[PDB]
From a paper:
One of these effectors, SidH, 253 kDa in size with no sequence similarity to proteins of known function is toxic when overexpressed in host cells. SidH is regulated by the LP metaeffector LubX which targets SidH for degradation in a temporal manner during LP infection.
The purified SidH was analyzed using single particle cryo-EM yielding a density map with a nominal resolution of 2.7 Å. The N-terminal region of SidH containing Hb1-4 forms an extended helical domain which lies roughly parallel to a similar helical domain formed by the C-terminal region containing Hb7-8 of the protein. With regards to specific interactions between SidH and tRNA, Arg819 of SidH interacts with the phosphates of U55, G57 and C56 of the tRNA. EF-Tu and SidH share a buried surface area of 1184 Å2 where the N-terminal region of SidH mediates interaction with the GTP-binding Domain 1 and the beta-barrel Domain 3 of EF-Tu. SidH W438 engages catalytic His85 of EF-Tu in a cation-pi interaction and also makes hydrophobic contacts with I61 and the aliphatic part of the R59 side chain. At site 2 of the SidH/EF-Tu interaction, the beta-barrel Domain 3 of EF-Tu interacts with Hb1 of SidH mainly through hydrophobic contacts.
Numbering used by the authors:
A (entry chain A): 3 to 89, 104 to 175, 189 to 206, 228 to 267, 279 to 339, 382 to 608, 617 to 655, 663 to 874, ...
B (entry chain C): 2 to 394
RNA sequence: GCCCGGAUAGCUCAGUCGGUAGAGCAGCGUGUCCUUGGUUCGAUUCCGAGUCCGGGCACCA
């Protein structure tokens, strides 16, 4: 029964298998887009069959390995959960913690991967948390283990900036082209420099500020500024953009080509403006030169990192030496690395210094064990080291076995880092080729030569012998860049002298190829004594003997070959010296554990180091409760603070909420949300602090669950804060508190994490829940499947792409979901099935007719289906006891969307305030920008009700203003706003005056005798008090629950209840209805419990009706008295009996609710009298 | 064998427990030699305790050793247990014969994982008293470190219901005392006095039916098969009939001689570490974990309801939950049996640190009764500790 | 007691870079690979424990 409940909860409430399938499909479709990601990354995720797992190799990049592991984990979890739906606790636990292992992989996963992956994996984090919570009640109950908030309705809250930023910025700069150019710059700077959240380019503010400053402005200074922009600023921005896109792995030029076009247009227009005031091509020679130099520097970085083999060799030597100990030698060392000889320790330290980061990233605790075993002196005792308990547990283990168990993972990590560097080098090569193509295309598809090019300068090295690593590394990279330059020059020579031979075995036609070939090796040809040949060839190739330049081909080839050889020899020497310097710097530095420092940066270590709990607590204790004391009326403040100036911290987690006023309950819930947020943040920071130097931190998948649970709690509480922030009197402090939690939406493993209601018949709802437990629809599903297979089997002349097949499959799925909850009338099923059969025949005959007849027929089918589904939805609405026009509109919308997709893929009081602002701002402009002021006013005054009479007042005053187009109209608008603000203040427990004065000040600021307005407000307050005194909510609810016969019925029912627990005993049971006839739903439920024969359906329906009557009051007593989960558990008659007993036992709490309503009236009259006293005091003081 | 084992002093069964390499064997040798210097004694050496070739090769104690020594008022049978985590089972067997345990904690190390594990296991196999010997105090001149170790050991003892604030702690040096440093032999004498005073003379059940858990089986050439162990209750005499109950089918035999530390005994009494010679049984028909009982007085059982505490990760237990069908090893006095676990209704998994009431069905019948404490071990670690709430079948 | 090696269909066995177990015979295989856990994105496969079986050491109240 409990296992069945868990299975149904997984299948229908969480739908975890479907969520996992959707996330996997979206991730795989995004990382194989080929329009957002390069083919290099996409080829790694190609599978012979979709049923095989992705194979993680030692030769694939690090990020490719992480993505493959995540996809495999998602597929395995989907398989396990689907297998669960086909029939359990162990299987679900294993699947949940496989997802958590994938999440832990993401936790340690190189923020590029994090931003690639987060938008998809954020969709199942709450599902995983809820699944873990549901699994938790199959374990023995642990009181106070969590002590968190009650997740009442979490199931109902289950849920291009980078490529558009720079083009938008340069478009804005294009728009910035006496006093007109003095505020536009300020506006642009405020709009753009404030933007953040995507500044992966770690200079962005500098470029935006410098570009704005330069765009604000003899001609020598202007030319110098232009060259500074063209050669220093924009090339650096483009290089950083390429760095971002290379680290991401996107296709070349994805976010660099639109940006490049934008800056090209901006620079061309700026240069044109400068020329008009008194060169500008953005790709003259040196922009290209600097771009290619940066590209080659990055390429050589990647190639050097990929061709390095010292770290892998050191790791292999370390693991071989550790595994060279047999059982006897391990026993002699007492299975501890600290007991080996000093020379062996020195060799092990020398090996371990070279690959410690890789070992420590995967094994932060084994790293500390190795460091302490190898570096500590043997004389020191363990006691003085003050090791922790779990550190001592690891210390007592077989050290050799512990280290040897890390070998495969560490070697795989090292080889995958090398593969990542090689893959980055390939990406940089693709970026270089694409940049060359775009540079060719952007100017004219033509090249221009110049004889004023500085010749080649083959660098020579006179280098020191006792310099740091970077000293030699810079020279190595310079030599490699020069090697690449000479290599491309010799390639150009080969192309030049091959095209010359193949085109004519100097007055030619296709001189562009020769021009572009000679531009590559012009500096090298100028390096030799051939300046005359160069100046005779540049002019001849730009305006016009080819039999003489072919003579000096072998000479220039030999020059290039010898220069490359010399550079290679110098590179080898420099690499040797750099390796020696690396060894020296490794020997100088002592060995120190690195695991905790690496764990401090994963994803949750970064969040923990923010200390958000401290700021939240400071706001809660100093800024929130101070505002509560200052603004809340004393009557409301009494229920929250028994000390008069501080919240009642002895009872902060309030749990009743049904003995309080709606405003008091709202404030208590807000306090609960803040308290739970603070506790969750503090727990999360405590679990992710790694500041103990004497402790180890084991990396495992079984902590993420805890993390997720904490996150859920925090987000849940934060959700309510936003719900409490949608109030006129609470917007400011709530917004401040949410601004404090701003650095949580943005971390990939939290995100928004949450969402950020029908009324049908009780019998219908119970039957729906019973149907969803026990799981025409089959007929329509089969018809949709036939339609889908007819579309798929379309092999006619009208070719249908596989993308269109996937799109129509998605459309058919959405349509099936939409119509799966639809009841059809007599004959409606026949009509809809005939229409769908005709539609599928038309789809099978798409190519048999002209497109016009096809579109007409499908439009007729769409109209017929829409009409039939409208009628069927109206029938279902009537028979389900719902409101007309609600379900029918949704069904028709689903049908219309489905048909539109099929035809496409086959070849408010806020409005009142806006009107008020528009009229008030058009009044002076028509009797003497606007949109921004109106929007600001509406946003600042969001949350007013305006009632049903003030609407007519507003309309009449607007009509009077229109007729008249002095201060009477503004006074009427102000008093309408003041009445609305008074309503808002009275709905909360706010002290009179505060929010009304705030809104009045805002209104009068936007605008740029009082006794009458004060008297009007006072009259409003008096009439409000009169209305409040006439309220009879408490007596009405008492009558509705148990009418004016409850005491007598209870007195005459108690003996019957006692008799419930021989032959003539049934006589009194039969005759009780002549003396104890119930008159209220509670007494009727008591009588039904007396009957006890819940096997019959008549009393089951009677109980359902009584519960329908009693639910709006029971839902306040407890949240479990809902209409979805409470009805789902009513399956057997014993369940009905248990529900009846549970409802009967809550009579005391219902009475408490009625007394709470009476107290709510008692508090409301006091608030009204306080407001009236304040207003009369203000009127008497104002004279 | 030759002598007759004159019975003069009350007999107590003590033994050394603690983490590996902390000085249990050295402490046993030092105790025996110092007591042989001050009193009669026998002066066993270190090599005579760890005498097996494998123990000498690996340099660790593997199997429990047995020595005897006499204070003026008591006669002690001392069991030296292995400290290595791989041989915990052997230690458990030794800890099943202990009326008292000397917890050897190295001052250079402090309490370690096997210190806590041995405390818990000795608690589960019936060790009621623990005396702490702070060993290697010749290498720790600091007094603050000694106080810290003392308080840590006291907290650890209190964590498992021993009177940590009342347990005597001796700051001594087994190696120096064995060498002959009189200032450090005074500490061994103080430890012997604490053995005499702190550990009360146990109340033995010499009237109940005879019962002896088997700890070891020997094949004495020319005599037959001898089963050694501590008589839990009753008296076994030469010529009496006994039954071997437990793992295999129960056998019947007769007692043809009782010995005690290679000295002939007329009758073996409760609480005494004796060896019983059985007539006409091969060494392969008996095993450790079986029980010698009076005929028709013990019925082996396979199923029982128990209340079990599952250790947390920080106590050396599991870090993941287990479900139905979990098949760990259950350690009763000298017996270890594989058993299957059935969880109570409404419970499908048990987290570390939980208290559960589960039904255990063993794969072999064993002798057990209500109130018999046991340990649960799996994967080379202790995962739980429970008591037999009641016997089903 | 301490090592070592095996256990895969009814029988005989292959499966080793960890990616859903297949060949013959017997009459087209829910055999998750003796069982239990652990590691792992993923276990017949790697680690541990346990149950049997086999054969090498130890011991000797
Ligand atoms: N300095 C010093 N060393 C000691 C002392 N006691 C023992 N040792 C040394 O510690 C080592 C531990 O040896 P054992 O006493 O046999 O270890 P154990 O307690 O039997 O632990 P197991 O090997 O599991 O049996 C010995 O080689 C001694 O040399 C001591 O009091 N002071
Ligand atoms: Mg020993």
């Amino acid at each position: 029964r409990t296992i069945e409940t868990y299975i149904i909860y997984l299948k229908e409430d969480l739908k975890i298998a479907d969520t996992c399938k959707t996330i996997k499909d979206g991730l795989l479709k995004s990382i194989t887009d080929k329009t957002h990601f390069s083919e290099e990354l996409a080829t790694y995720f190609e599978r012979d069959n979709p049923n095989a797992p992705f194979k993680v190799n030692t030769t694939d990049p690090t990020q490719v390995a992480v993505l493959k592991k995540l996809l495999n984990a998602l597929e395995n979890a989907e398989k396990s959960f689907r297998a669960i739906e086909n029939i359990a606790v162990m299987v679900s636990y294993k699947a949940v913690h496989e997802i958590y292992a994938a999440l832990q992989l993401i936790n340690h996963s190189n923020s590029d991967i994090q931003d690639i992956v987060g938008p998809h994996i954020q969709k199942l984090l709450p599902q995983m948390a809820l699944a873990s919570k549901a699994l938790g009640n199959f374990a023995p109950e642990h009181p106070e283990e969590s002590a968190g908030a009650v997740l009442a309705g979490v199931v109902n809250m289950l849920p291009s900036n980078l490529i558009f930023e720079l083009p938008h910025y340069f478009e804005e700069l294009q728009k910035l082209i006496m006093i007109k150019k003095a505020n536009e710059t300020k506006y642009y700077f405020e709009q753009l420099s404030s933007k953040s959240g995507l500044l992966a380019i770690p200079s962005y503010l500098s470029i935006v500020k410098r570009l704005i400053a330069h765009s604000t402005d003899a001609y020598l200074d202007a030319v110098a500024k232009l060259e500074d922009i063209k050669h220093n600023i924009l090339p650096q921005l483009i290089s950083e953009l390429e760095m971002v896109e290379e680290s991401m792995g996107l296709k070349p030029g994805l976010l660099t080509d639109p940006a490049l076009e934008q800056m090209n247009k901006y620079y061309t227009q700026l240069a044109e403006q400068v020329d008009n005031i008194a060169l500008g091509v953005l790709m003259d020679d040196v922009f290209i030169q600097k771009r290619r130099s940066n590209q080659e520097s990055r390429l050589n970085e990647a190639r050097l990192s990929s061709e390095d083999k010292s770290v892998l060799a050191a790791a292999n030597r370390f693991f071989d030496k550790i595994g060279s100990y047999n059982s006897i030698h391990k026993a002699w060392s007492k299975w501890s690395l600290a007991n080996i000889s000093q020379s062996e320790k020195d060799a092990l330290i020398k090996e371990y210094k070279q690959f410690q980061p890789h070992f420590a990233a995967l094994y932060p605790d084994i790293d500390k064990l190795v460091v302490d075993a190898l570096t500590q002196p043997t004389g020191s005792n363990i006691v003085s080291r003050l090791y922790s308990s779990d550190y001592k547990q690891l210390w007592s283990s077989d050290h050799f076995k512990q280290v040897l168990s890390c070998k495969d993972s560490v070697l795989s990590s090292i080889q995958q880092s090398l593969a990542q560097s090689e893959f980055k080098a390939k990406l940089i090569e693709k970026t270089m080729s694409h940049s060359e193509e775009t540079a060719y295309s952007m100017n004219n598809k033509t090249t221009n030569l110049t004889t004023r090019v500085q010749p080649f300068e083959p660098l020579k090295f006179t280098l020191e012998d006792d310099k740091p690593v970077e000293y030699y590394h810079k020279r190595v990279i310079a030599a490699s860049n020069q090697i690449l330059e000479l290599e491309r020059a010799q390639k150009g020579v080969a192309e030049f002298f091959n095209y010359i031979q193949k085109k004519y075995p100097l007055d030619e036609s296709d001189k562009e190829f020769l021009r572009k070939a000679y531009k590559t090796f012009q500096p090298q040809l100028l390096a030799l004594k051939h300046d005359d040949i160069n100046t005779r060839l540049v002019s001849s190739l730009t305006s016009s003997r080819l039999t003489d330049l072919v003579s000096l081909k072998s000479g220039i080839n030999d020059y290039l070959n010898e220069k490359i050889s010399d550079l290679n020899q110098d590179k080898t020497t420099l690499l040797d010296k750099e390796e020696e310097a690396r060894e020296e710097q490794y020997a100088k530095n002592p060995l120190v554990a690195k695991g905790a420092e690496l764990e401090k940066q994963t994803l949750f270590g970064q969040m923990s180091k923010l200390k958000l709990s401290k700021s939240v607590d400071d706001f809660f204790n100093k800024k929130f409760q101070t505002y509560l004391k200052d603004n809340l009326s004393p009557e409301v403040w009494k229920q929250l603070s028994s000390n008069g100036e501080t919240l009642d911290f002895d009872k902060i987690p309030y749990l009743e909420f049904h003995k309080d006023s709606p405003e008091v309950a709202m404030y208590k819930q807000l306090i609960n949300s803040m308290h739970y947020m603070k506790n969750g943040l503090e727990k999360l920071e405590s679990l992710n602090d790694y500041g103990d130097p004497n402790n180890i931190y084991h990396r495992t998948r079984f902590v993420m669950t805890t993390f997720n649970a904490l996150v859920m709690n925090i987000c849940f509480s934060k959700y309510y804060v936003m719900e409490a922030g949608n109030n006129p009197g609470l917007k400011a402090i709530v917004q401040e508190g949410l601004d404090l939690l701003k650095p949580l939406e943005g971390m990939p493993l939290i995100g928004d994490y949450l969402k950020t209601p029908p009324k049908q018949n009780i019998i219908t709802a119970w039957k729906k829940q019973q149907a969803v437990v026990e799981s025409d629809q089959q007929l329509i599903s089969e018809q949709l499947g036939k339609i889908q297979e007819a579309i798929d089997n379309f092999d006619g002349d009208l070719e249908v792409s596989d993308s269109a097949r996937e799109k129509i499959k998605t459309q058919i799925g959405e349509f099936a979901k939409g119509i799966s909850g639809l009841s059809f009338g007599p004959g409606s099923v026949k009509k809809i099935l005939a229409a769908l059969t005709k539609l599928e025949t038309q789809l099978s005959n798409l190519d048999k007719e002209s497109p016009e007849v096809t579109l007409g027929k499908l439009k007729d089918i769409h109209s017929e289906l829409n009409a039939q589904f409208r009628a069927a939805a109206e029938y279902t609405e009537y028979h389900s006891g719902q409101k007309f026009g609600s379900y029918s509109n949704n069904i028709s919308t689903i049908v219309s969307n489905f048909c539109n997709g099929l035809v496409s893929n086959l070849p408010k009081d806020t409005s009142y305030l806006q009107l008020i602002a528009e009229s008030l701002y058009q009044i002076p402009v028509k009797l003497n920008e606007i949109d921004a002021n109106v929007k600001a006013f509406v946003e600042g005054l969001n949350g007013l009700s305006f009632g049903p009479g003030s609407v007519k007042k507003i309309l009449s005053t607007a009509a009077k203003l229109q007729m008249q187009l002095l201060k009477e109209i503004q006074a009427e608008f102000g008093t309408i706003l003041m009445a609305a603000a008074d309503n808002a203040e009275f709905h909360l427990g706010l002290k009179p005056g505060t929010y009304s004065r705030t809104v009045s000040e805002r209104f009068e600021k936007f605008y740029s005798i009082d006794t009458t307005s004060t008297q009007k407000r006072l009259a409003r307050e008096m009439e409000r008090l009169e209305s409040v005194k006439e309220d009879t909510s408490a007596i009405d609810t008492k009558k509705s629950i148990f009418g004016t016969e409850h005491e007598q019925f209870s007195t005459l029912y108690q003996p019957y209840a006692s008799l419930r627990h021989l032959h003539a005993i049934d006589r009194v049971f039969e005759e009780r209805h002549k003396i104890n006839k119930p008159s209220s739903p509670f007494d009727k439920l008591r009588d039904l419990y007396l009957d006890g024969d819940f096997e019959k359906e008549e009393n089951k329906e009677q109980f359902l009706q009584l519960y329908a009557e009693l639910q709006p009051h029971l839902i306040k007593i407890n949240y479990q008295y809902d209409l979805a989960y409470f009805l789902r558990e009513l399956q057997t008659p014993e369940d009905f009996k248990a529900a009846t007993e549970r409802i009967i036992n809550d009579e005391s709490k219902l009475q408490e609710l009625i007394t709470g309503l009476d107290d709510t009236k008692r508090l409301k009259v006091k608030l009204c009298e306080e407001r009236i006293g304040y207003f009369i005091d203000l009127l008497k003081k104002q004279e | 064998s030759k002598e007759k084992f004159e019975r003069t002093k009350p007999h107590v069964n003590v033994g050394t427990i603690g983490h590996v390499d902390h000085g249990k064997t050295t402490l046993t040798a030092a105790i025996t030699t110092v007591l042989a210097k001050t009193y009669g004694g026998a002066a066993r050496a270190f090599d005579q305790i760890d005498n097996a070739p494998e123990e000498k090769a690996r340099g660790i104690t593997i199997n429990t050793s047995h020595v005897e020594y006499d204070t003026p008022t008591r006669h002690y049978a001392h069991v030296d247990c292995p400290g290595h985590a791989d041989y915990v089972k052997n230690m458990i067997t030794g800890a099943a014969q202990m009326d008292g345990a000397i917890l050897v904690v190295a001052a250079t190390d402090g309490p370690m994982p096997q210190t806590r594990e041995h405390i818990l296991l000795g608690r589960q196999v019936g060790v009621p008293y623990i005396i702490v010997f702070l060993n290697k105090c010749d290498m720790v001149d600091d007094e603050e470190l000694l106080e810290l170790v003392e308080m840590e050991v006291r907290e650890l003892l209190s964590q498992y219901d021993f009177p940590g604030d009342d347990t005597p702690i001796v700051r001594g040096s087994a190696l120096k005392a064995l060498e002959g440093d009189a200032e450090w032999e005074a500490k061994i004498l103080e430890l012997a006095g604490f053995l005499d005073s702190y550990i009360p003379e146990p109340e033995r059940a010499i009237d109940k039916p005879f019962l002896l858990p088997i700890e070891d089986v020997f094949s004495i050439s020319g005599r037959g098969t001898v089963v050694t162990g501590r008589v839990e209750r009753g008296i076994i005499k030469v010529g009496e009939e006994v039954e071997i109950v437990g793992i295999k089918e129960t056998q019947k035999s007769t007692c043809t001689g009782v010995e005690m530390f290679r000295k002939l005994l007329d009758e073996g009494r409760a609480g005494e570490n004796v060896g019983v010679l059985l007539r006409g049984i091969k060494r392969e028909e008996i095993e450790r974990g079986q029980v010698l009982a009076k005929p028709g007085t013990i019925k082996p059982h396979t199923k029982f309801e128990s209340e079990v505490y599952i250790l947390s990760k920080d106590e050396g237990g599991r870090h993941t939950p287990f479900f139905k069908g979990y098949r760990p090893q259950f350690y009763f006095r000298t017996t270890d049996v594989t058993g299957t676990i059935e969880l109570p209704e409404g419970v499908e998994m048990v987290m570390p640190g939980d208290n559960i009431k589960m039904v255990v069905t063993l794969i072999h019948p064993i002798a057990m009764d209500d109130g018999l404490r046991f340990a649960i071990r799996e994967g080379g670690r202790t995962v739980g500790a429970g008591v037999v709430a009641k016997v089903l079948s």
